[PDB]
mmCIF file of C-alpha atoms and ligand atoms in Angstrom:
data_model
loop_
_atom_site.group_PDB
_atom_site.id
_atom_site.type_symbol
_atom_site.label_atom_id
_atom_site.label_comp_id
_atom_site.label_asym_id
_atom_site.label_seq_id
_atom_site.Cartn_x
_atom_site.Cartn_y
_atom_site.Cartn_z
ATOM 1 C CA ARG A 1 -56.850 -186.913 -170.562
ATOM 2 C CA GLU A 2 -57.502 -186.284 -174.454
ATOM 3 C CA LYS A 3 -60.946 -184.867 -176.004
ATOM 4 C CA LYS A 4 -61.008 -186.740 -178.888
ATOM 5 C CA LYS A 5 -59.712 -189.847 -176.896
ATOM 6 C CA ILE A 6 -62.225 -189.998 -174.507
ATOM 7 C CA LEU A 7 -64.875 -189.289 -176.779
ATOM 8 C CA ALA A 8 -63.677 -192.444 -179.036
ATOM 9 C CA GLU A 9 -63.706 -195.070 -176.063
ATOM 10 C CA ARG A 10 -67.610 -193.576 -175.516
ATOM 11 C CA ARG A 11 -68.411 -195.578 -178.787
ATOM 12 C CA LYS A 12 -68.492 -198.640 -177.150
ATOM 13 C CA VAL A 13 -70.252 -197.146 -174.042
ATOM 14 C CA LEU A 14 -73.495 -195.533 -175.907
ATOM 15 C CA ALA A 15 -73.626 -198.708 -178.449
ATOM 16 C CA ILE A 16 -73.375 -201.727 -175.846
ATOM 17 C CA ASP A 17 -73.009 -200.336 -172.442
ATOM 18 C CA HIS A 18 -77.324 -200.111 -171.729
ATOM 19 C CA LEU A 19 -79.279 -202.616 -172.879
ATOM 20 C CA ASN A 20 -80.740 -206.315 -173.334
ATOM 21 C CA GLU A 21 -79.198 -209.379 -172.391
ATOM 22 C CA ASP A 22 -81.209 -211.048 -175.378
ATOM 23 C CA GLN A 23 -80.233 -208.160 -177.614
ATOM 24 C CA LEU A 24 -76.518 -208.282 -176.989
ATOM 25 C CA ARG A 25 -76.670 -212.080 -177.397
ATOM 26 C CA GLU A 26 -77.814 -210.994 -181.125
ATOM 27 C CA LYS A 27 -75.598 -207.932 -181.146
ATOM 28 C CA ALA A 28 -72.269 -209.333 -180.420
ATOM 29 C CA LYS A 29 -72.829 -211.823 -183.392
ATOM 30 C CA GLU A 30 -72.995 -208.779 -186.033
ATOM 31 C CA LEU A 31 -70.438 -207.591 -184.530
ATOM 32 C CA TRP A 32 -68.166 -210.485 -185.322
ATOM 33 C CA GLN A 33 -69.650 -210.471 -188.731
ATOM 34 C CA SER A 34 -68.556 -207.099 -189.651
ATOM 35 C CA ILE A 35 -65.356 -207.733 -188.414
ATOM 36 C CA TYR A 36 -64.923 -211.300 -190.433
ATOM 37 C CA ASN A 37 -66.418 -209.088 -193.699
ATOM 38 C CA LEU A 38 -63.711 -206.628 -193.044
ATOM 39 C CA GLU A 39 -60.991 -209.115 -192.373
ATOM 40 C CA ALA A 40 -62.054 -210.889 -195.592
ATOM 41 C CA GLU A 41 -61.839 -207.527 -197.447
ATOM 42 C CA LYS A 42 -58.198 -206.986 -195.712
ATOM 43 C CA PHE A 43 -56.723 -210.484 -197.104
ATOM 44 C CA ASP A 44 -58.286 -209.666 -200.935
ATOM 45 C CA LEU A 45 -56.644 -205.772 -200.479
ATOM 46 C CA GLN A 46 -53.463 -207.718 -199.790
ATOM 47 C CA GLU A 47 -53.547 -210.455 -202.499
ATOM 48 C CA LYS A 48 -54.203 -207.717 -205.195
ATOM 49 C CA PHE A 49 -51.093 -205.753 -203.405
ATOM 50 C CA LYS A 50 -48.852 -208.716 -204.124
ATOM 51 C CA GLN A 51 -49.963 -208.708 -207.942
ATOM 52 C CA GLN A 52 -49.590 -204.976 -208.467
ATOM 53 C CA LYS A 53 -45.571 -205.436 -207.067
ATOM 54 C CA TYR A 54 -45.414 -207.787 -209.836
ATOM 55 C CA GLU A 55 -47.714 -205.659 -212.213
ATOM 56 C CA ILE A 56 -45.149 -202.612 -211.611
ATOM 57 C CA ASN A 57 -41.942 -204.554 -211.922
ATOM 58 C CA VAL A 58 -42.925 -205.799 -215.482
ATOM 59 C CA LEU A 59 -43.656 -202.140 -216.296
ATOM 60 C CA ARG A 60 -40.252 -200.699 -215.075
ATOM 61 C CA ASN A 61 -38.607 -203.547 -216.930
ATOM 62 C CA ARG A 62 -40.662 -202.562 -220.070
ATOM 63 C CA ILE A 63 -40.623 -198.875 -220.029
ATOM 64 C CA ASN A 64 -36.834 -199.480 -219.856
ATOM 65 C CA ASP A 65 -35.978 -201.893 -222.423
ATOM 66 C CA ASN A 66 -38.258 -200.069 -224.747
ATOM 67 C CA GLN A 67 -35.912 -197.038 -224.731
ATOM 68 C CA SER B 1 -38.505 -223.707 -240.375
ATOM 69 C CA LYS B 2 -37.525 -226.546 -238.538
ATOM 70 C CA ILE B 3 -40.959 -227.576 -238.058
ATOM 71 C CA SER B 4 -44.288 -226.918 -239.427
ATOM 72 C CA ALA B 5 -46.173 -223.663 -238.717
ATOM 73 C CA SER B 6 -49.280 -226.216 -237.953
ATOM 74 C CA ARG B 7 -47.240 -227.609 -235.043
ATOM 75 C CA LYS B 8 -45.730 -224.112 -234.194
ATOM 76 C CA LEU B 9 -49.604 -223.177 -233.408
ATOM 77 C CA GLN B 10 -50.727 -226.552 -231.772
ATOM 78 C CA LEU B 11 -47.983 -226.422 -229.124
ATOM 79 C CA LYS B 12 -48.705 -222.282 -228.694
ATOM 80 C CA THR B 13 -52.424 -223.611 -227.982
ATOM 81 C CA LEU B 14 -51.322 -226.139 -225.525
ATOM 82 C CA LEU B 15 -49.182 -223.774 -223.091
ATOM 83 C CA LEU B 16 -51.831 -221.576 -222.882
ATOM 84 C CA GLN B 17 -54.048 -224.434 -222.370
ATOM 85 C CA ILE B 18 -51.848 -225.093 -218.791
ATOM 86 C CA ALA B 19 -51.298 -221.452 -218.096
ATOM 87 C CA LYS B 20 -54.843 -220.986 -217.596
ATOM 88 C CA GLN B 21 -54.852 -224.045 -215.394
ATOM 89 C CA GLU B 22 -52.186 -222.991 -213.551
ATOM 90 C CA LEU B 23 -54.100 -219.778 -212.902
ATOM 91 C CA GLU B 24 -57.451 -221.358 -211.876
ATOM 92 C CA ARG B 25 -55.191 -223.757 -209.685
ATOM 93 C CA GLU B 26 -53.895 -220.612 -208.361
ATOM 94 C CA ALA B 27 -57.158 -219.004 -207.201
ATOM 95 C CA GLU B 28 -57.949 -222.652 -205.672
ATOM 96 C CA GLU B 29 -55.201 -222.058 -203.520
ATOM 97 C CA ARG B 30 -55.531 -218.660 -202.831
ATOM 98 C CA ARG B 31 -59.263 -219.297 -201.642
ATOM 99 C CA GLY B 32 -58.025 -222.122 -199.203
ATOM 100 C CA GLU B 33 -55.137 -219.584 -197.768
ATOM 101 C CA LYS B 34 -58.048 -217.424 -197.288
ATOM 102 C CA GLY B 35 -60.312 -219.593 -195.272
ATOM 103 C CA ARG B 36 -57.318 -220.587 -193.430
ATOM 104 C CA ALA B 37 -56.235 -216.831 -192.694
ATOM 105 C CA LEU B 38 -60.200 -216.095 -191.782
ATOM 106 C CA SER B 39 -60.421 -218.682 -189.201
ATOM 107 C CA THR B 40 -57.047 -217.434 -187.431
ATOM 108 C CA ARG B 41 -57.768 -213.878 -187.386
ATOM 109 C CA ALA B 42 -62.032 -214.177 -187.178
ATOM 110 C CA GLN B 43 -61.988 -217.439 -184.566
ATOM 111 C CA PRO B 44 -65.880 -217.849 -184.657
ATOM 112 C CA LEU B 45 -68.237 -216.823 -181.866
ATOM 113 C CA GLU B 46 -69.422 -219.314 -179.203
ATOM 114 C CA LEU B 47 -70.775 -218.769 -175.890
ATOM 115 C CA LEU B 48 -72.450 -216.275 -171.387
ATOM 116 C CA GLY B 49 -72.492 -214.114 -168.285
ATOM 117 C CA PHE B 50 -74.738 -211.391 -168.827
ATOM 118 C CA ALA B 51 -72.207 -208.933 -166.937
ATOM 119 C CA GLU B 52 -68.959 -210.210 -168.329
ATOM 120 C CA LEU B 53 -70.545 -211.262 -171.832
ATOM 121 C CA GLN B 54 -70.780 -207.365 -172.169
ATOM 122 C CA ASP B 55 -66.891 -206.490 -172.001
ATOM 123 C CA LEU B 56 -66.361 -209.165 -175.128
ATOM 124 C CA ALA B 57 -68.723 -207.047 -177.113
ATOM 125 C CA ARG B 58 -67.007 -203.730 -175.817
ATOM 126 C CA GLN B 59 -64.035 -205.556 -177.442
ATOM 127 C CA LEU B 60 -65.462 -206.718 -180.448
ATOM 128 C CA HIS B 61 -66.528 -202.981 -180.805
ATOM 129 C CA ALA B 62 -63.171 -201.335 -180.280
ATOM 130 C CA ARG B 63 -61.784 -204.391 -182.742
ATOM 131 C CA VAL B 64 -64.033 -203.049 -185.904
ATOM 132 C CA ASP B 65 -62.750 -199.531 -185.268
ATOM 133 C CA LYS B 66 -59.097 -201.108 -185.612
ATOM 134 C CA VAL B 67 -59.819 -203.481 -188.416
ATOM 135 C CA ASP B 68 -61.441 -200.934 -190.544
ATOM 136 C CA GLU B 69 -57.908 -198.654 -190.313
ATOM 137 C CA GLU B 70 -56.100 -201.940 -191.047
ATOM 138 C CA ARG B 71 -58.403 -202.330 -194.259
ATOM 139 C CA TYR B 72 -58.061 -198.826 -195.266
ATOM 140 C CA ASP B 73 -54.390 -198.807 -195.090
ATOM 141 C CA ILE B 74 -53.802 -201.362 -197.271
ATOM 142 C CA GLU B 75 -56.679 -200.395 -199.506
ATOM 143 C CA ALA B 76 -55.166 -196.634 -199.760
ATOM 144 C CA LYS B 77 -51.913 -198.679 -200.738
ATOM 145 C CA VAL B 78 -53.496 -200.608 -203.732
ATOM 146 C CA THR B 79 -55.101 -197.198 -204.325
ATOM 147 C CA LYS B 80 -51.867 -195.621 -204.969
ATOM 148 C CA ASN B 81 -50.582 -198.810 -206.831
ATOM 149 C CA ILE B 82 -53.608 -198.104 -209.344
ATOM 150 C CA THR B 83 -52.399 -194.768 -209.848
ATOM 151 C CA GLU B 84 -48.768 -195.932 -210.457
ATOM 152 C CA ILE B 85 -49.826 -198.628 -212.836
ATOM 153 C CA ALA B 86 -51.796 -196.447 -215.024
ATOM 154 C CA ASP B 87 -49.184 -193.846 -214.973
ATOM 155 C CA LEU B 88 -46.823 -196.443 -215.956
ATOM 156 C CA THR B 89 -48.356 -197.856 -218.683
ATOM 157 C CA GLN B 90 -49.383 -194.641 -219.988
ATOM 158 C CA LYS B 91 -45.704 -194.034 -220.499
ATOM 159 C CA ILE B 92 -44.971 -196.749 -222.363
ATOM 160 C CA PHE B 93 -48.285 -196.672 -224.812
ATOM 161 C CA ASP B 94 -45.992 -193.468 -226.249
ATOM 162 C CA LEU B 95 -43.035 -195.638 -227.384
ATOM 163 C CA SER B 96 -64.472 -211.349 -247.908
ATOM 164 C CA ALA B 97 -64.192 -215.180 -248.232
ATOM 165 C CA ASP B 98 -67.110 -217.173 -247.916
ATOM 166 C CA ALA B 99 -69.663 -214.061 -249.466
ATOM 167 C CA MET B 100 -67.290 -214.660 -252.627
ATOM 168 C CA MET B 101 -67.378 -218.542 -252.591
ATOM 169 C CA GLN B 102 -70.733 -218.280 -253.313
ATOM 170 C CA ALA B 103 -71.192 -215.466 -256.207
ATOM 171 C CA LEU B 104 -68.504 -217.429 -257.917
ATOM 172 C CA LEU B 105 -69.415 -221.023 -258.218
ATOM 173 C CA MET C 1 -49.745 -213.093 -236.592
ATOM 174 C CA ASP C 2 -48.688 -214.211 -239.883
ATOM 175 C CA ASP C 3 -47.754 -218.203 -239.178
ATOM 176 C CA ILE C 4 -51.218 -218.762 -237.877
ATOM 177 C CA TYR C 5 -52.248 -218.453 -241.672
ATOM 178 C CA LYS C 6 -49.961 -220.762 -242.743
ATOM 179 C CA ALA C 7 -51.149 -223.174 -240.174
ATOM 180 C CA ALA C 8 -54.496 -222.795 -241.598
ATOM 181 C CA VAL C 9 -53.510 -223.438 -244.968
ATOM 182 C CA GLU C 10 -51.910 -226.689 -243.982
ATOM 183 C CA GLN C 11 -54.911 -227.585 -242.426
ATOM 184 C CA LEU C 12 -57.305 -227.030 -245.536
ATOM 185 C CA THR C 13 -58.538 -230.491 -246.509
ATOM 186 C CA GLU C 14 -57.821 -231.076 -250.159
ATOM 187 C CA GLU C 15 -61.389 -230.902 -251.164
ATOM 188 C CA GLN C 16 -61.640 -227.506 -249.867
ATOM 189 C CA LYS C 17 -58.442 -226.505 -251.880
ATOM 190 C CA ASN C 18 -59.971 -227.844 -254.620
ATOM 191 C CA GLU C 19 -62.936 -225.483 -254.695
ATOM 192 C CA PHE C 20 -60.543 -222.717 -254.187
ATOM 193 C CA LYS C 21 -58.303 -223.624 -256.771
ATOM 194 C CA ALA C 22 -61.779 -223.905 -259.202
ATOM 195 C CA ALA C 23 -62.940 -220.681 -257.823
ATOM 196 C CA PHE C 24 -59.295 -219.264 -258.524
ATOM 197 C CA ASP C 25 -59.357 -220.722 -262.189
ATOM 198 C CA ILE C 26 -62.079 -218.352 -262.644
ATOM 199 C CA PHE C 27 -60.993 -215.592 -261.166
ATOM 200 C CA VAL C 28 -58.004 -215.611 -263.293
ATOM 201 C CA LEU C 29 -59.642 -216.014 -266.599
ATOM 202 C CA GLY C 30 -58.569 -213.666 -268.999
ATOM 203 C CA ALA C 31 -55.084 -212.769 -267.272
ATOM 204 C CA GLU C 32 -51.969 -212.804 -268.717
ATOM 205 C CA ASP C 33 -49.743 -214.114 -266.048
ATOM 206 C CA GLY C 34 -52.315 -216.185 -264.999
ATOM 207 C CA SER C 35 -52.771 -214.817 -261.526
ATOM 208 C CA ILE C 36 -55.023 -211.834 -259.761
ATOM 209 C CA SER C 37 -53.517 -208.543 -260.676
ATOM 210 C CA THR C 38 -55.706 -205.137 -260.301
ATOM 211 C CA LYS C 39 -58.050 -206.246 -263.095
ATOM 212 C CA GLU C 40 -58.804 -209.312 -262.071
ATOM 213 C CA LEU C 41 -59.519 -208.457 -258.366
ATOM 214 C CA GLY C 42 -61.073 -205.071 -259.371
ATOM 215 C CA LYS C 43 -63.955 -207.342 -261.347
ATOM 216 C CA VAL C 44 -64.879 -209.635 -258.581
ATOM 217 C CA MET C 45 -64.845 -207.044 -256.253
ATOM 218 C CA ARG C 46 -66.951 -204.251 -257.364
ATOM 219 C CA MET C 47 -69.209 -206.894 -258.771
ATOM 220 C CA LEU C 48 -69.245 -208.216 -255.209
ATOM 221 C CA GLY C 49 -71.159 -205.612 -254.085
ATOM 222 C CA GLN C 50 -68.063 -203.073 -253.471
ATOM 223 C CA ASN C 51 -66.134 -200.670 -255.161
ATOM 224 C CA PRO C 52 -62.755 -200.193 -253.938
ATOM 225 C CA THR C 53 -60.311 -197.607 -255.446
ATOM 226 C CA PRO C 54 -57.339 -199.300 -257.463
ATOM 227 C CA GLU C 55 -54.909 -197.513 -254.904
ATOM 228 C CA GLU C 56 -56.777 -199.387 -252.026
ATOM 229 C CA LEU C 57 -57.098 -202.673 -253.954
ATOM 230 C CA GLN C 58 -53.230 -203.275 -254.527
ATOM 231 C CA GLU C 59 -53.150 -203.411 -250.088
ATOM 232 C CA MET C 60 -54.861 -206.778 -250.252
ATOM 233 C CA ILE C 61 -52.763 -208.011 -252.924
ATOM 234 C CA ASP C 62 -49.817 -206.457 -250.992
ATOM 235 C CA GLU C 63 -50.886 -207.900 -247.758
ATOM 236 C CA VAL C 64 -50.113 -211.303 -249.076
ATOM 237 C CA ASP C 65 -47.563 -210.791 -251.630
ATOM 238 C CA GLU C 66 -45.056 -213.044 -251.156
ATOM 239 C CA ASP C 67 -43.344 -212.469 -254.114
ATOM 240 C CA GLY C 68 -43.419 -209.048 -255.043
ATOM 241 C CA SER C 69 -45.046 -209.437 -258.492
ATOM 242 C CA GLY C 70 -48.057 -207.337 -257.513
ATOM 243 C CA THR C 71 -50.064 -210.491 -258.589
ATOM 244 C CA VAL C 72 -51.722 -212.985 -256.051
ATOM 245 C CA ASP C 73 -50.525 -216.347 -257.179
ATOM 246 C CA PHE C 74 -52.784 -219.456 -256.091
ATOM 247 C CA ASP C 75 -50.433 -220.086 -253.214
ATOM 248 C CA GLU C 76 -50.879 -216.845 -252.086
ATOM 249 C CA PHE C 77 -54.319 -216.878 -253.192
ATOM 250 C CA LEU C 78 -54.865 -219.668 -250.212
ATOM 251 C CA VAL C 79 -53.490 -217.352 -247.500
ATOM 252 C CA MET C 80 -56.096 -214.695 -248.771
ATOM 253 C CA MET C 81 -58.885 -216.902 -248.328
ATOM 254 C CA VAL C 82 -57.511 -218.070 -244.626
ATOM 255 C CA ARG C 83 -57.014 -214.398 -243.630
ATOM 256 C CA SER C 84 -60.949 -213.851 -243.789
ATOM 257 C CA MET C 85 -62.353 -217.031 -242.380
ATOM 258 C CA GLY C 86 -57.796 -214.542 -230.795
ATOM 259 C CA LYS C 87 -56.631 -213.644 -227.327
ATOM 260 C CA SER C 88 -57.299 -210.688 -225.408
ATOM 261 C CA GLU C 89 -54.251 -208.656 -224.329
ATOM 262 C CA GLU C 90 -55.450 -208.055 -220.771
ATOM 263 C CA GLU C 91 -55.934 -211.919 -220.721
ATOM 264 C CA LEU C 92 -52.596 -212.694 -221.903
ATOM 265 C CA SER C 93 -51.065 -210.442 -219.255
ATOM 266 C CA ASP C 94 -52.225 -212.838 -216.750
ATOM 267 C CA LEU C 95 -51.061 -215.718 -217.987
ATOM 268 C CA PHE C 96 -47.351 -214.495 -218.734
ATOM 269 C CA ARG C 97 -47.240 -214.471 -215.184
ATOM 270 C CA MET C 98 -47.577 -218.263 -214.934
ATOM 271 C CA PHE C 99 -44.547 -218.183 -217.461
ATOM 272 C CA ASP C 100 -42.201 -216.228 -215.587
ATOM 273 C CA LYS C 101 -41.904 -218.496 -212.715
ATOM 274 C CA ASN C 102 -38.805 -217.149 -210.981
ATOM 275 C CA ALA C 103 -40.986 -213.883 -211.414
ATOM 276 C CA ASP C 104 -38.296 -211.508 -212.512
ATOM 277 C CA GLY C 105 -40.392 -210.171 -215.491
ATOM 278 C CA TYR C 106 -39.006 -212.037 -218.463
ATOM 279 C CA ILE C 107 -39.218 -215.584 -220.135
ATOM 280 C CA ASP C 108 -35.972 -217.410 -220.135
ATOM 281 C CA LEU C 109 -35.687 -220.902 -222.041
ATOM 282 C CA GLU C 110 -36.075 -222.843 -219.026
ATOM 283 C CA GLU C 111 -39.369 -221.435 -217.997
ATOM 284 C CA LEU C 112 -40.590 -222.080 -221.859
ATOM 285 C CA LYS C 113 -39.016 -225.770 -221.613
ATOM 286 C CA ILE C 114 -40.868 -226.171 -218.183
ATOM 287 C CA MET C 115 -44.396 -225.601 -219.796
ATOM 288 C CA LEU C 116 -43.202 -227.468 -222.753
ATOM 289 C CA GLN C 117 -43.035 -230.393 -220.698
ATOM 290 C CA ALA C 118 -46.498 -229.594 -218.705
ATOM 291 C CA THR C 119 -48.051 -229.860 -221.878
ATOM 292 C CA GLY C 120 -48.114 -233.887 -221.971
ATOM 293 C CA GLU C 121 -46.976 -233.844 -225.602
ATOM 294 C CA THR C 122 -43.662 -235.000 -226.894
ATOM 295 C CA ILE C 123 -41.083 -231.901 -226.838
ATOM 296 C CA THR C 124 -38.457 -232.226 -229.399
ATOM 297 C CA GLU C 125 -35.245 -229.997 -229.365
ATOM 298 C CA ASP C 126 -36.256 -228.516 -232.359
ATOM 299 C CA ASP C 127 -39.712 -227.533 -231.272
ATOM 300 C CA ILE C 128 -38.015 -225.909 -228.206
ATOM 301 C CA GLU C 129 -35.489 -224.562 -230.759
ATOM 302 C CA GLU C 130 -37.830 -223.021 -233.223
ATOM 303 C CA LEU C 131 -40.084 -221.570 -230.686
ATOM 304 C CA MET C 132 -37.617 -219.550 -228.613
ATOM 305 C CA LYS C 133 -36.316 -218.090 -231.481
ATOM 306 C CA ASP C 134 -39.949 -217.556 -232.699
ATOM 307 C CA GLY C 135 -41.071 -215.346 -229.483
ATOM 308 C CA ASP C 136 -37.347 -214.008 -228.787
ATOM 309 C CA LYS C 137 -37.102 -211.386 -231.927
ATOM 310 C CA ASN C 138 -34.022 -209.585 -230.430
ATOM 311 C CA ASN C 139 -32.051 -212.446 -229.465
ATOM 312 C CA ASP C 140 -31.530 -212.195 -225.683
ATOM 313 C CA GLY C 141 -32.731 -215.188 -224.463
ATOM 314 C CA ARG C 142 -35.687 -213.774 -223.117
ATOM 315 C CA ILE C 143 -39.077 -212.940 -223.828
ATOM 316 C CA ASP C 144 -40.477 -209.620 -222.444
ATOM 317 C CA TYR C 145 -44.026 -209.004 -221.730
ATOM 318 C CA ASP C 146 -44.497 -206.704 -225.306
ATOM 319 C CA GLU C 147 -42.981 -210.011 -227.487
ATOM 320 C CA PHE C 148 -44.808 -212.314 -225.317
ATOM 321 C CA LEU C 149 -48.366 -210.437 -226.880
ATOM 322 C CA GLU C 150 -46.804 -210.734 -230.249
ATOM 323 C CA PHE C 151 -45.950 -214.191 -229.460
ATOM 324 C CA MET C 152 -49.553 -215.299 -229.053
ATOM 325 C CA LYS C 153 -51.371 -213.317 -231.466
ATOM 326 C CA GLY C 154 -54.516 -214.885 -232.290
ATOM 327 C CA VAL C 155 -53.872 -218.192 -230.192
ATOM 328 C CA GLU C 156 -57.273 -219.834 -229.253
HETATM 329 CA CA1 CA D 201 -47.153 -212.934 -256.369
HETATM 330 CA CA1 CA D 202 -38.420 -215.619 -215.870
HETATM 331 CA CA1 CA D 203 -36.555 -210.504 -226.105
#
């Protein structure tokens, strides 16, 4: 029984557990659209992380050799 | 020099000419890699039973709160990389004719 | 950035080299060594709607003085002409990764040869030689990022 855990899971109940079957139709849609868009942001954020490890390593080579 | 500087320059231009094409080829590969990673991580929606249609919309709502945290954790890693990249880059930086031809001839 | 001008000099049409020789022979009208000293470069500059200093005048002579005799001869004058007739660093960095195939952070000879054969043009033993010792300006068999920038100056 955590105060911040009980309140967190209530966000579903306040947003979903109360209304229409025809709005739940066109609301579960936008809930997936948000995941897909965030899953796209997460893919691009991962790819940029790969390129930075190369960018950083090339810098570590340059900073060393130029000394 | 063993070869003419006109060839030396013609070869240098053709090296970048394909290195660009390998980059655009790399972008198309990364475009296809994303769509595949999105049909796996974001299996599209399809239908239900009005009662047990809801416990999935509840499950989606919980997913968004976790996806955005995973997106934040990788973003904050990219953010700290930007700080170090700019810091590392700061360290290393420390270490007429045609107007004449007409007015002559 | 130097051996990019000699190429433009090499590809001058003999109808362009004629106009330059003609314009060069007016330039040097009344010079002892028949070459552009500071008087000659002085007149034609102040009369070209300018007025550079006697010191500032020499740094245009010495910018293309591959002789050291304080006088721009005709061959140096062609380099001077093509100097007044590239690729951004941020863009050359993105391509530096395409060479470095093993992702180590340098461009060894093998990665250079693979790109050269991928150009479709016929590579020779002497094309590969001259190019590597042109880019590798300390003879370590590899081209680090800083040299690759000097290597691709002004390349289209
Ligand atoms: Ca000279
Ligand atoms: Ca390498
Ligand atoms: Ca080197």
